[PDB]
Amino acid sequence: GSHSMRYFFTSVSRPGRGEPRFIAVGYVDDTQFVRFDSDAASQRMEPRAPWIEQEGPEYWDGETRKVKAHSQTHRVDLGTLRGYYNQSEAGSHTVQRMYGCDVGSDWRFLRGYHQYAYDGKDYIALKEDLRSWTAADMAAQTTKHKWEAAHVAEQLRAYLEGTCVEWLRRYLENGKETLQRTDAPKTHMTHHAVSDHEATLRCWALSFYPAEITLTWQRDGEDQTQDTELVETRPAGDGTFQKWAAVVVPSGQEQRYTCHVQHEGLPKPLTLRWE
């Protein structure tokens, strides 16, 4: 029953080919519900989930205004970081920001976060007390000093503990058919020879939501984690997710291997066997 709301922002500079490209998406748990693309024609925040379309024009006008505002800060931020790092305009660079809040099964506030990355590396992050910052390098310390003098964490903590929690609950209620479901994985194993003496064992989980899942292989009860191929959890395209784990084993030894599946939709963890 735990839930998150998260906003993700990406701005990428493109020297002498216009203003930076800004893309923004919003999620409730593993379900996208809004997008903004600075290259798209609408120049509006757009719905991406059925249950958010019911919001009135005040909502859409205001979220468009605010997301364009985020677009403008990240545009200044790209210039700021160029200065902090003595970088020219020969290069495209990337700023990323993520913030949001978590509630428990009781829908009361759990924790909040607000993070930045520059060119793929941690830059600065709000710590879990929502009072202090983690600055990754000397440039981010400069930001930290400015944000402490400007009392940035106070203002974020008020948003994260208030507005963020209240609208997460609203969205959870309005989209409860979509959001408050749990779809347990449908699981099976496949077997295919790779030679006259070896076979691929692959453990599948399909049609599950939310995306959180654990698949492990054991051999005679011993975890084979170092020997397992694990693909990244992937979307089916319909709001559910897929995952598999494979080992290559000696033909004859299939009965030693078991797959173990953990997901919140299963009353108990599953063990799949070759007998």
Partner: peptide, 9 residues
């Protein structure tokens, strides 16, 4: 909902 606060690095 989005935050109205302006945040600059």
């Amino acid at each position: 909902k989005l935050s109205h606060q302006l945040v600059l690095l």
